[PDB]
A paper describes a structure:
We have solved the crystal structure of this SPNct–IFS complex by single anomalous diffraction and refined the model at 1.70 Å resolution. The model includes 830 residues in two copies of the complex (residues 193–446 of SPN and residues 1–161 of IFS) and 596 water molecules. Our 1.70 Å structure of the SPNct–IFS complex is highly similar to the previously reported structure determined at 2.80 Å, with r.m.s. deviations of 0.62–0.70 Å for 410 Cα atoms for each heterodimeric complex. The complex buries a large surface area at the interface between SPNct and IFS (3210 Å2 and 3280 Å2 for A:B and C:D interfaces, respectively). Our higher-resolution (1.70 Å) structure reveals that the interface is very rich in water molecules; 67 and 71 water molecules are identified at the A:B and C:D interfaces, respectively. It makes an extensive water-mediated hydrogen-bond network with the residues located on α2, α8, α8–β3 loop and α9–β4 loop of SPNct (Gln216 on α2; Ile328 and Lys329 on α8; Gly330 and Asp332 on α8–β3 loop; Gly368, Asn370, Asn373, Ile374, Gln378, Thr379, Trp380, Glu389 and Glu391 on α9–β4 loop).
Once translocated into the cytoplasm of the host cell, SPN contributes to virulence by depleting the intra­cellular NAD pool and producing the potent vasoactive compound nicotinamide, but not by ADP-ribosylation of protein substrates. SPN is also toxic to bacterial cells; therefore S. pyogenes encodes the ifs gene, which encodes the immunity factor for SPN (IFS) as an endogenous antitoxin. IFS functions as a competitive inhibitor of the substrate β-NAD+ by blocking the active site in the C-terminal domain of SPN.
Author numbering:
A (entry chain B): 1 to 161
B (entry chain A): 193 to 446
Write the structure that this text describes.
Amino acid sequence: MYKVPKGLEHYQKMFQKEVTVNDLKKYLIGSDKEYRITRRDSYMGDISDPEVILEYGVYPAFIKGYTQLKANIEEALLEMSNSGQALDIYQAVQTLNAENMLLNYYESLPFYLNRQSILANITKALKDAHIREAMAHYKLGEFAHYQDTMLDMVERTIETF
Amino acid sequence: GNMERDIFEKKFKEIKDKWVTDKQADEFIETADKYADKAVQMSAVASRAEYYRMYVSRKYHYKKEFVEKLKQVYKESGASHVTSKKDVMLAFDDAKRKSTIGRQENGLFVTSFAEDMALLFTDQGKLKSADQIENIKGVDSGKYSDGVYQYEYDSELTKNIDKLGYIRTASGDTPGANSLNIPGCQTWSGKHIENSESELIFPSISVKDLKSKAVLAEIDAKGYFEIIDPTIIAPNGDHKKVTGRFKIKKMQDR
């Protein structure tokens, strides 16, 4: 069962307060370094890690009573998935994925996202030729060091939903 | 002051990750010259000044003979990467990782198996506590509360990987490097520089078609899970079957 981690208290405190939908988007993306939430072993280091955000930020704050985080994260995710911006859709896909990875490990989580509309939006994003092309070509930051494209990472992740 | 340490500190501040505490940041700066000197003594870098210059350039380079000397250690004992059960699961389950242990063609950070054997066990051959090992490795408290897991390339695998020319040294822009990575083929281990171990990058292991649930059950039952003649990912992305043994272990008393 999920349990609040001991570490990274600064991340825990970040979410124990009023957090807007716009702020959650900035955190989930992490293109702005001031909002970049990672850990030592995060797969990439130059964009946020949505698994860290759920595990260390959102779930601990939810548990302390900041229940508005669930609806607000869902709206942040809806917005990101409809943004038409490669990195943001990628980060949306990675947050739904993060829930699944945390479910696999912890076997039970504080809550489960309402994700039907987010899933739909993602499907519709990936039907758009210009979005697929941006994702196929996305080679900024650490993506430049992988043969595996953003697009294919996204596609293989969607298949696991 | 000294210009080399001024640029060092400036560069660190520019790249510092959001998970780094003020205390770690302060220790990283304060201890910098001890790590520079360690690298000089190991013939890893030309001089303490050169250590700082290479850190700022982000381009870590080393002399052939030094890297050959260091590889000898790994060839003798094999290679080790300690990790959590959660991270082992992610290698199999997380689709962006493409069923590889390590960052696809970008590889896996390792130390020598001998070094982890020396550092993680007491003189009575007892595994140190999770708390002690989390401290040694500078990870978050509770990282190993579910077990100290370990990837092991054996000597034979290591030798054949070297014969292919697939061993790498880290650089400033290596995927998986962060703001606490340093030059000198060595780890930054905080104020306790006695915990610092050598550092190389090994080719990733393909776990295509393996299931995390079953692998973790085999580990629970026998203490390890082994791949004979694993498929490795070359730096250029080639998949190549290499003779030797790779293990995923839950570390335990001798």
